[PDB]
Amino acid sequence: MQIFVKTLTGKTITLEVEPSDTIENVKAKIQDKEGIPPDQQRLIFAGKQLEDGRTLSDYNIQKESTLHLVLRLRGG
Amino acid sequence: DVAARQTTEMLKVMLQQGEAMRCPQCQIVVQKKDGADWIRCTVCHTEICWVTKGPRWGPGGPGDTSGGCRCRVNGIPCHPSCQNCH
Amino acid sequence: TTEMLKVMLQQGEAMRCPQCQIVVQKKDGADWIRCTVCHTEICWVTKGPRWGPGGPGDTSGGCRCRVNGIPCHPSCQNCH
Ligand SMILES: [Cl-]
Ligand SMILES: [Zn+2]
Ligand SMILES: [Zn+2]
Ligand SMILES: [Zn+2]
Ligand SMILES: [Zn+2]
Ligand SMILES: [Zn+2]
Ligand SMILES: [Zn+2]
Numbered sequence: 001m002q003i004f005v006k007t008l009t010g011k012t013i014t015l016e017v018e019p020s021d022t023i024e025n026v027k028a029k030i031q032d033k034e035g036i037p038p039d040q041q042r043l044i045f046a047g048k049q050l051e052d053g054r055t056l057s058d059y060n061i062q063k064e065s066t067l068h069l070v071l072r073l074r075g076g
Numbered sequence: 077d078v079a080a081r082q083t084t085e086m087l088k089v090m091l092q093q094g095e096a097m098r099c100p101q102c103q104i105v106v107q108k109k110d111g112a113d114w115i116r117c118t119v120c121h122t123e124i125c126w127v128t129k130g131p132r133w134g135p136g137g138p139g140d141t142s143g144g145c146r147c148r149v150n151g152i153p154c155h156p157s158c159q160n161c162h
Numbered sequence: 163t164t165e166m167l168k169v170m171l172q173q174g175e176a177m178r179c180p181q182c183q184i185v186v187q188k189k190d191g192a193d194w195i196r197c198t199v200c201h202t203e204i205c206w207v208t209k210g211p212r213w214g215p216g217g218p219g220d221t222s223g224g225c226r227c228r229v230n231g232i233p234c235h236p237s238c239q240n241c242h
Contacts, residue, residue, distance in 0.1 A: 008119070009103035035236040040118055042107065047082030068083050070096065071104055071118055075111020075126065076162055102232050120232050135231075 001063040003056070005030065005043075012066070017056060024052040030069065044068040099124065100131045113161040125161040128154050132162055180204060180211040193241040205241045208234050212241060 001019070004012045015029050027038035043050040045059055045067050061067070087105065090096035096107045101122040108115050113127040123132040125145040134143030147154035147161050154161060167185060170176040176187045182200035189195050193207040203212035205225040214223030227234035227241050234241060 007104055009098065036118055044083050044086065046079035047086040066080065068087070068105070071099075071106045072109050073106055073115045073118065075108050076114045076116070076160070101230075118236050122231075 003061060004064070004066040006066060006068045007034070019057045019062075020055055022053060022055050023050045026056070026067075027052070036069075036071065040071055040073060042070040042072045044070060094129070097124070097126075097129045113155075113158050123162060125154060127158045127161055138162075174209075177204075177206070177209050193238050203242065205234060207238045207241055 001017060003015050003017050005015060006012055013030075013033060015026065015033070017026060017029070023043060024038065026043065027041045030036055030041060031038055045061055045065065048059070050059060050067075056062075087096065090105075090107070096105050098104070099106050099117045099120065099122060102117060102120040104117070104119050106115060106117060106124065108126050113125065114132055115124050115126060116122070117124060123138060124130070125132045125147070128145045131144045132138075132147075134140035136142065141149050145154035145161065146152075147158060167176060167187075170187060171178075171185060176185050178184065179186050179197045179200060179202065181202040182197060184197070184199050186195060186197060186204060188206065193205065194212060195204045195206050196202070197204060203218060204210075205212040205227065208225045211224045212218075212227075214220035216222065221229055225234035225241065226232075227238060
């Protein structure tokens with residue numbers, strides 16, 4: 001199936017996922033497609049930060065759902 | 077669709093509390109984890125002044141005080157709580 | 163050899179030219195490659211055409227690196 005991830009204002013990427021994929025797996029697909037290290041990624045769905053070990057299923061993320069990507073960066 | 081609104085509301089709260097902002101160049105949402113009063117955007121490499129929630133520099137990049145927070149120009153910090161925004 | 167080339171394509175150490183579809187091997191260090199056959203400009207770091215059909219400068223297609231100050235990819239150093 002497919003899910004969407006909001007990045008820049010107004011911009012979305014599409015990802016190829018399975019209901020059983022974990023959050024760490026999704027962040028790996030984001031890194032492959034967008035070049036953002038997984039340790040910098042925080043994913044949000046329906047107002048909740050997603051935990052690396054749970055799966056799209058646990059969070060009730062279905063086809064055409066939309067996640068929001070936030071960058072978590074270290075201060076200088 | 078209740079999902080979308082819950083996420084919009086969460087982001088609104090993050091912005092209001094100062095826990096997140098939009099990168100002023102590329103408009104991705106960024107959060108700062110630890111460290112000093114500045115971060116560099118991963119997407120576009122813009123330096124961001126966290127304590128004023130805005131760009132550190134003008135369009136010429138690092139060194140360009142024609143815009144940005146102008147920390148220490150004429151000796152004046154960009155914010156009274158600034159310790160180091162680069 | 164052709165067998166190793168098959169694996170490089172499989173593994174992403176090679177790509178097909180976006181204009182002419184011939185196999186293009188990686189130029190280590192470089193974010194840009196000029197195809198040796200059709201001479202089109204390739205953005206290696208995004209694995210796509212550097213430009214639209216109008217050629218160099220045409221940001222109606224391609225990776226649009228540096229438009230509005232935004233690099234085409236966080237790892238890009240210079241894709242021309
Ligand atoms: Cl900058
Ligand atoms: Zn940015
Ligand atoms: Zn500042
Ligand atoms: Zn400052
Ligand atoms: Zn070619
Ligand atoms: Zn490029
Ligand atoms: Zn580039």
